[PDB]
Design a protein around this ligand. Sequence first.
Ligand SMILES: CCCCCCCC/C=C\CCCCCCCC(=O)N[C@@H](CO[C@@H]1O[C@H](CO)[C@@H](O)[C@H](O)[C@H]1O)[C@H](O)/C=C/CCCCCCCCCCCCC
Ligand code: NI
Length: 203
Amino acid sequence: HLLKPLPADKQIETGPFLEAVSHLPPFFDCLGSPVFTPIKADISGNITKIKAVYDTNPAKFRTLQNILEVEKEMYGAEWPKVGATLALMWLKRGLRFIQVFLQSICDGERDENHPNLIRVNATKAYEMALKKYHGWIVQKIFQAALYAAPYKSDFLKALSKGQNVTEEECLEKIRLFLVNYTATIDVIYEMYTQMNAELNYKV
Ligand SMILES: CCCCCCCC/C=C\CCCCCCCC(=O)N[C@@H](CO[C@@H]1O[C@H](CO)[C@@H](O)[C@H](O)[C@H]1O)[C@H](O)/C=C/CCCCCCCCCCCCC
Ligand code: NI
């Protein structure tokens, strides 16, 4: 299934969002390299934390905007470096990395001298989504992941394990997934900017 479409007023229901993005971390089990373990843990850990907050009062935390706004009231000067707000601040970055990476691949972006690597696509996604927030030690993790990254064809076979679809059919399904996914992430970014909740610290 696809993510829910964005409503006209751009308020994103928490429950459906968490349920949908909860399907993303299992993909990492298809990628054998040791770095995918802490990557999966990071993404899943943030999902878990936002879910834990949501579950304390689903009515009050019905939308992601509710989460930020209510946490701001709950935590005073500790906000936004607190709670589900912090978890979602980092989740959105992981989700944008995925967005940019997959979009790049689907649009045929490549290094003409290495057309079956995915380095250029991962580098674009990293620069757009994560690099500004990573100190050198974490950047080394990215660099090592790049070196060991699967070939494009292998990667796409993993995305479509279970489906028996062609590479081109796999890309078409990703393009459709990307529609509501991209729109939703863009709203989450806007929300953090509007609330002055984007933090710029490096890890
Ligand atoms: C259709 C479905 C498609 C699925 C396909 C998925 C393919 C995706 C591949 C990789 C996704 C990578 C996402 C990584 C997100 C990392 C977020 C991050 O920077 N989290 C930080 C901060 O952590 C935060 O610290 C905070 C406190 O300061 C805490 O409060 C937070 O809870 C905590 O999250 C953490 O320090 C870093 C974790 C790992 C960084 C990995 C760097 C890049 C990975 C290499 C990618 C190459 C891909 C090649 C293709 C296979
Ligand atoms: Ni689902």
